[PDB]
Amino acid sequence: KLPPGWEKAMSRSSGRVYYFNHITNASQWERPSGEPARVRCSHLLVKHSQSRRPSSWRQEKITRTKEEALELINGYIQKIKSGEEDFESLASQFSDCSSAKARGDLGAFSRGQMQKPFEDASFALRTGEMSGPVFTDSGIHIILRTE
């Protein structure tokens, strides 16, 4: 039917069908289009109190809850999708990863290097595509595949 991980769903508010990916947590109205040894991705990380290391260059001690972190992630996705803000701009200002200094860019990587939820979502994206919330032991991520 559809590319890896995509399924059909019904909207509760409109009754219109949409498409959802259970590997990347992306969702969209339009039917999705169309594996490599390496991919290149940026990300924006929001840490929380249950993060493996509850510390970032932005905050010496992170206090926010997992639920607050997810609401922050949700709002950033909104601004990116509406075009009010660029992914790169929000990653530079707000990512709790030190890669914020390079606009969220992590370079190219193979399977076997990143935490598995991150790796799975990164390899299920197509070039140019962005994920929904992705959960790992570091926090909550938005992943953008660039190559």
Ligand SMILES: C#CCN1CCS(=O)(=O)CC1
């Ligand atoms: C490299 C690096 C920083 N971070 C990337 C996403 S992760 O979830 O694989 C944990 C490590």
